[PDB]
C-alpha cells in the first residue's frame, strides 16, 4: 500500500494525543440467532491536537460501527473549538485504523471529542474482550474477560493504542444482574438496573490513573473470592471459579500477594497508588499472567494452588508469577516503556525483581540463585547467535504487532534480568534501589527509554561517590545496545585476560553493526583456591593483572556465583587444576560455579574454544554430586547432545554414560526418602530428587523403570487414591506411559479429560506425549487441534511436547510443513508463543536434508510469512548450519568418549 499516506504506516502520527476516554461495554454471554457471542459498546475520547491536521487516525480492530449523524463517528468541539465536518471514514485493515477524513484542519493546541458506537465478536480467541468458558456440573459458564497487551485494546474500542499515549479511562460495564463486573478501579457508586431491561445491571467504575491502553481490564463473571487488606492498606482479593475458591485453592495467593506488594513499595520507596489489587484466574488465557493495573489476570495454573495435589515446583511458579506481575505495578504500569523496542524496561525488570519479591515471601527456598539457570544460561543459548538482537532494538525496526509480540522473548526477559543482576552486583542492591527510587519518582505516570534509567542510576552513584571506570550509561550501553556477550579467556601463566564476542558458530555472519565494536566493559569477580579476590574491570580487548596469574597448585575461577553476563575460558592447565579440584573435593568450588564450569565448557566446545572431551570430563564428578544446580546445568547442556545424537549410534553410549553417572544419586534418594515415602525438606534437594528420577528412568536404570511402572499400576488399580507424591507426578506419569502401552495411555487420557485441577491436567497432558508408539503420537496430535478436547490456550504447548519426543520429531515437522497457513492464522502466528513452536520443531536439525527442508519451508511460505516467528526461523537456519558442522566434527570423538567413560 501507498507509504506516502499516514494511514498506511504502522506508527500513529504525532499530531493527536488523547487526554481521557469513557467507554461503555456490554457483553452478551449467550449466543445470538447467528450463533455468535457479541459485545456492544460506545466510547468518547477527548484528545488534543498537537499539530494541525485534516485526518483523525485512531486504532480499530474487528469492530463494526453504528452510523450516527451520517458517519461512523461524531466529532465535537471542546472549550469552544469548532471542528470541521467529517467528509468520510474508512477502515484500513493492515495498520488496524479507523481513519476520519475531515473537510478542514483541526487547530493546534485545541481539544476535541469523538463519539463512537460499535460492536465486536466476544470470540474464543483469547485477545481483546473475549470469552472464557468452564463447566460447573452440566451448566456452561461463560465469562467475558480481556487481554489487551500488546495491541488488542483497539479490538474492544477505538483508541490511540500505543503505550506512550497515556490517558485516564472511565469504564462502565453493562452485565446480567446476577454477575459481578470488575475493572482496574473500584465501582463508582452502586450498580443500578438498566432502564431498558432490569435483567441487566450498569456498573460504572472510578476514573483510572493516567495509564497505557494495554493495561485496561474488563471482566464479567460469577467468580467468588477471598480477601485481605495488605499492611500498606491496599485491599487484595483473589478471584476464581467458585469451586476453586471454596476448596481453598486461592489461599496461597492470598498469603503472599499483599506481603509482596508491601515489600516492593518499601524496597523502591514508592507507594502503590490504587485502592485495590485484584488477582483473578481465568480458565482460558493466552499468556501465563498479565499485570493489568488493579486487576491482574492469570492462567489458573499460575494463581491457584492445592497443597494436597500441586507440586513444590507448582508452588514456586505461583509465588514467582505473582511477584513478577506485582513488580510490573512499578516497572511497567506506574512507569512505562516509551515504545516496545525497549520492552526489557518492563519485562527485564519484572524478571529480576520477581526473585526479590518471591524471596521475601519464601526466604528458606533460596530462589535468587535460580537466576543463573533460569535466566543467564537460558538466554545465552540464543544470544550466542549472529541472528540474536540487542536488549534495546532500534525503535524504527519495531513497527507491526507481529514484530512487537516477537520481542516477548528470552532477550527482553532473561537477558534483561541478567544485566540487572550484574548491575545490582557491581553497584550493590542498596545503591541500585536508590537510583530506581529516583527513576520511579521522576517518571511516575510517564514513559521512559533506556537512557532515562542510566541517568537516575548515575545520580545514586554520584551521591555515594562510587568510582567506576566510566559513567553508568557507557558501561551499560555496551550490554544494552549491541547483541551478545563476551567470552573472557584467562591465561593463568601470565595473568592475561582477553574478551571477544562469543559465537556458538565461529563461521556465523554478524551483519548487525555495533558502534561499540562488540567490546564490553566487564566487572570481573574471581576466587583463588576458593577465596574471593579483589574485583577487577576489564575495559579493553586484552589486559594483564597478577589477580589472574597462578603458580604451583593454585587455581582461579572468574565470575563468582555467575553475577556477570559472560562466559569464561582458561588455559588447559587451569582447567586441569579445576578438574582435579572436582575430583579431590568438589565442595571447595561454590555450587553456582560448579554449574558454570559445566555449562561454560559445553558451550565453549561448540564454539571450538575447548575440546569436547574437556567439557565431557567436567561431568565426571557428577557421580558424587547431590546438589540440584550442577546436575541441572549438565542436563541442560546435554539436552543439545540428545537433540544431535538421539537418532544415531552415539545415543546408546550416551544413555549408558548418564545411567552410570546418576545411579548412585538415584539409590541415595531411594534410601533417604525411605523408599519414596517422604520428600526432602529443602526445595533444591526436592528438585535434585526429581531430576535424579527423570534421568535414571530416561537412561535405563532398571530400579527406576520398576518404580515408576509399579506406582502407575497401583494408581490404575485405585484411581481415586493416587499413591504418587505431587513432586514425582510429571516424571512418573511420563515414564510409566513411555514404558507402557495403550492401556496406560488411555487411563491417563481419561484422567486428563476428567481433571479438576489445571496443575494435574498439565502433568497428564505432557505425559501423554511420552508414548513411544507413532500411531498414538499421531492420534494425540489430532486431539491438540480439537478445542473440545484440548483448550486452545494449550494447543501449541502440547504440540511442542510431542515434537520433543524422538518418535514425534518427523511427525510434527511434517505436520508443520503441511499446515503452515492453519497454524499461522488460527494458532497465534502473530502472538507470544509462536517462536517456541518453530524453535522446538527445528532444534534437532543436523543434516543437509533437514536444512534443505527448512530452506524450502521458508521459500514456500514467503506469502504468508512467519509473523512473530520470523527471527526464530532465521535462528533455526543459523543453528541448523552450525549443527551439521558440529556433528561432523564431533560425532566420532563423542561416540568414543561416552563408550570409554560409561563402563
Amino acid at each position: 500500500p501507498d507509504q506516502s499516506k499516514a494511514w498506511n504506516r504502522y506508527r500513529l502520527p504525532n499530531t493527536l494525543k488523547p487526554d481521557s476516554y469513557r467507554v461503555t461495554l456490554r457483553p452478551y454471554l449467550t449466543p445470538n440467532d447467528r450463533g455468535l457471542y457479541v459485545f456492544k459498546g460506545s466510547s468518547t475520547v477527548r484528545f488534543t491536537c498537537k499539530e494541525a491536521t485534516d485526518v483523525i487516525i485512531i486504532h480499530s480492530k474487528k469492530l463494526n460501527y453504528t452510523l450516527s449523524q451520517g458517519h461512523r463517528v461524531v466529532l465535537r468541539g471542546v472549550g469552544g473549538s469548532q471542528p470541521p465536518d467529517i467528509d468520510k471514514t474508512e477502515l484500513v485493515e493492515p495498520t488496524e485504523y479507523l481513519v476520519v477524513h475531515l473537510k478542514g484542519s483541526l487547530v493546534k493546541d485545541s481539544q476535541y471529542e469523538m463519539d463512537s458506537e460499535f460492536e465486536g465478536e466476544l470470540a474464543d480467541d483469547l485477545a481483546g474482550f473475549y470469552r472464557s468458558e468452564y463447566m460447573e456440573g452440566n451448566v456452561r459458564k461463560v465469562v467475558a474477560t480481556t487481554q489487551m497487551q500488546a495491541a488488542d485494546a483497539r479490538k474492544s474500542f477505538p483508541c490511540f493504542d500505543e503505550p506512550a499515549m497515556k490517558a485516564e479511562f472511565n469504564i462502565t460495564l453493562i452485565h446480567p444482574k446476577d454477575l459481578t463486573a470488575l475493572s482496574n478501579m473500584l465501582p463508582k457508586g452502586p450498580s443500578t438496573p438498566l432502564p431498558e431491561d432490569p435483567n441487566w445491571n450498569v456498573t460504572e467504575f472510578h476514573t483510572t490513573p493516567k495509564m497505557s491502553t494495554y493495561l485496561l481490564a474488563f471482566i464479567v463473571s460469577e467468580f467468588d473470592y477471598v480477601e485481605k487488606q495488605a499492611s500498606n492498606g491496599v485491599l487484595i482479593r483473589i478471584w476464581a471459579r467458585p469451586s476453586a475458591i471454596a476448596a481453598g485453592h486461592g489461599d496461597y495467593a492470598l498469603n503472599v500477594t499483599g506481603p509482596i506488594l508491601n515489600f516492593f513499595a518499601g524496597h523502591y520507596d514508592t507507594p502503590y497508588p490504587l485502592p485495590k489489587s485484584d488477582q483473578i484466574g481465568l480458565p482460558d488465557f493466552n499468556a501465563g499472567a498479565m499485570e493489568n493495573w488493579g486487576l491482574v489476570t492469570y492462567r489458573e495454573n499460575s494463581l491457584l494452588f492445592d497443597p494436597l495435589s500441586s507440586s513444590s515446583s507448582n508452588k514456586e511458579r505461583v509465588v514467582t508469577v505473582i511477584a513478577h506481575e506485582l513488580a510490573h505495578q512499578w516497572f511497567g504500569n506506574l512507569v512505562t516503556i516509551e515504545w516496545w523496542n525497549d520492552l526489557w524496561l518492563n519485562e527485564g525488570f519484572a524478571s529480576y525483581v520477581e526473585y526479590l519479591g518471591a524471596d521475601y515471601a519464601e526466604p528458606t527456598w533460596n530462589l535468587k540463585d535460580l537466576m543463573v539457570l533460569n535466566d543467564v544460561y537460558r538466554v545465552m543459548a540464543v544470544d550466542a547467535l549472529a541472528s540474536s538482537h540487542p536488549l534495546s532494538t532500534p525503535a524504527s525496526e519495531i513497527n507491526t504487532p507481529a514484530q512487537i509480540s516477537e520481542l516477548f522473548d528470552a532477550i527482553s526477559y532473561s537477558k534483561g534480568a541478567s544485566v540487572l543482576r550484574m548491575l545490582s552486583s557491581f553497584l550493590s542492591e542498596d545503591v541500585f534501589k536508590q537510583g530506581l527510587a529516583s527513576y520511579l519518582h521522576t517518571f511516575a505516570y510517564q514513559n521512559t527509554i533506556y537512557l532515562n534509567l542510566w541517568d537516575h542510576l548515575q545520580e545514586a552513584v554520584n551521591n555515594r561517590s562510587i568510582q567506576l571506570p566510566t559513567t553508568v550509561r557507557d558501561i551499560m550501553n555496551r550490554w544494552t545496545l549491541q547483541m551478545g556477550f563476551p567470552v573472557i579467556t584467562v591465561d593463568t601463566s601470565t595473568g592475561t585476560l582477553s574478551q571477544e564476542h562469543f559465537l556458538l558458530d565461529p563461521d556465523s555472519n554478524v551483519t548487525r553493526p555495533s558502534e561499540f565494536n562488540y567490546v564490553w566493559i566487564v566487572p570481573i569477580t574471581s576466587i583463588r583456591d576458593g577465596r574471593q579476590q579483589q574485583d577487577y574491570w576489564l575495559i579493553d580487548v586484552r589486559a594483564q593483572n597478577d589477580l589472574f596469574s597462578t603458580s604451583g597448585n593454585e587455581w582461579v575461577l572468574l565470575n563468582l556465583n555467575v553475577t556477570g553476563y559472560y562466559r569464561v575460558n582458561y588455559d588447559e592447565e587451569n582447567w586441569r587444576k579445576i578438574q582435579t579440584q572436582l575430583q579431590r573435593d568438589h565442595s571447595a568450588i561454590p555450587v553456582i560455579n560448579r554449574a558454570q564450569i559445566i555449562n561454560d565448557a559445553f558451550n565453549l566446545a561448540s564454539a571450538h574454544k575447548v575440546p569436547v572431551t574437556l567439557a565431557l570430563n567436567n561431568t565426571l564428578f557428577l557421580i558424587e554430586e547431590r546438589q540440584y544446580m550442577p546436575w541441572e546445568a549438565a542436563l541442560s547442556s546435554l539436552s543439545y547432545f540428545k537433540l544431535m545424537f538421539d537418532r544415531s549410534e552415539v545415543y546408546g553410549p550416551m544413555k549408558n554414560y548418564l545411567k552410570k553417572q546418576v545411579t548412585p544419586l538415584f539409590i541415595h534418594f531411594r534410601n533417604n526418602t525411605n523408599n519414596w515415602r517422604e520428600i526432602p525438606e529443602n526445595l533444591m534437594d526436592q528438585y535434585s530428587e526429581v531430576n535424579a528420577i527423570s534421568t535414571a528412568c530416561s537412561n535405563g536404570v532398571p530400579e527406576c523403570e520398576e518404580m515408576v511402572s509399579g506406582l502407575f499400576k497401583q494408581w490404575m488399580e485405585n484411581p481415586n487414591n493416587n499413591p504418587i507424591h505431587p513432586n514425582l507426578r510429571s516424571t512418573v506419569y511420563c515414564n510409566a506411559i513411555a514404558q507402557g502401552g495403550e492401556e496406560e495411555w488411555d487411563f491417563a487420557w481419561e484422567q486428563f479429560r476428567n481433571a479438576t485441577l489445571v496443575n494435574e491436567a498439565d502433568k497428564l497432558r505432557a505425559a501423554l506425549a511420552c508414548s513411544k508408539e507413532l500411531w498414538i503420537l499421531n492420534r494425540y496430535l489430532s486431539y491438540t487441534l480439537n478445542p473440545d478436547l484440548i483448550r486452545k490456550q494449550d494447543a501449541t504447548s502440547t504440540i511442542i511436547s510431542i515434537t520433543n519426543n524422538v518418535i514425534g520429531q518427523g511427525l510434527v515437522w511434517d505436520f508443520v510443513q503441511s499446515n503452515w497457513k492453519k497454524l499461522f492464522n488460527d494458532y497465534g502466528g502473530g502472538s507470544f508463543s509462536f517462536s517456541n513452536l518453530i524453535q522446538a520443531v527445528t532444534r534437532r536439525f543436523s543434516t543437509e536434508y533437514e536444512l534443505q527442508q527448512l530452506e524450502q519451508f521458508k521459500k514456500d511460505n514467503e506469502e504468508t510469512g512467519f509473523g512473530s516467528g520470523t527471527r526464530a526461523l532465521e535462528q533455526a537456519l543459523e543453528k541448523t548450519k552450525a549443527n551439521i558442522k558440529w556433528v561432523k566434527e564431533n560425532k566420532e570423538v563423542v561416540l568414543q568418549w561416552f563408550t570409554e567413560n560409561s563402563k
Binding site: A287, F408, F832, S833
Partner: peptide, 4 residues
C-alpha cells in the same frame, strides 16, 4: 506479560 509471563509468556507460559
Amino acid at each position: 506479560x509471563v509468556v507460559d
